[PDB]
């Protein structure tokens, strides 16, 4: 197989340049992130491993939402109003 060709043909270059971050991280940045985890890169490409380069910050915020699960509709609205009041 020709990895460089496949990368180009599937459009991956549009967001991934060799050394420069654009819409996506540079290939150097991705390569360095997977140092000692190289099998995991193949798993990532197969949809079988989580993103490790720029992981969604949902991981920090999502558990915080469990604290709001019992709130009433009035309490949720009040909370949202408080947030919105800033500005």
Question: In the complex, what is the shortest distance from the CB of residue 14 to ligand HEC, in angstroms, rounded to a whole number?
Answer: 5
Tokens of 24: 């996506």
Phi, psi of 76 (to 5 degrees): -60, -45
Query: Could you say which of ligand HEC, a copy of itself, none residue 70 binds, taking C-beta under 5 to 8 angstroms by partner kind?
Result: none
The greatest distance separating any two alpha carbons of the chain, rounded to the nearest whole angstrom, comes to: 60
Can residue 2 be called a binding residue for a copy of itself (CB under 8 A)? Answer: yes
- Told to check if 65 binds a copy of itself by CB under 8 A, we report yes
Short-list 30, 9, 11, CA closest to 20: 30
The backbone torsions φ and ψ at residue 45, rounded to the nearest 5 degrees and listed phi first, read -65, -30
Interface contacts to ligand HEC, rule CB under 6 A:
10-12, 14-16, 23-25, 30, 44-45, 51-54, 57-58, 60-61, 64, 67-68, 79, 83
Task: Return binding residues for heme c.
Answer: 12, 15-16, 34, 52-54, 61
């Amino acid at each position: 197989a020709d990895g460089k060709a496949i990368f180009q043909q599937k459009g991956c270059g549009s967001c991934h340049q060799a050394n420069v971050d654009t819409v996506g991280p540079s290939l150097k940045k991705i390569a360095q992130a997977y140092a000692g985890k190289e099998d995991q890169l193949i798993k990532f490409l197969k949809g079988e491993a989580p993103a490790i380069v720029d992981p969604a910050k949902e991981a920090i915020m999502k558990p915080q939402l469990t604290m709001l699960k019992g709130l009433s509709d009035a309490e949720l609205k009040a909370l949202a109003d408080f947030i919105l009041s800033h500005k």
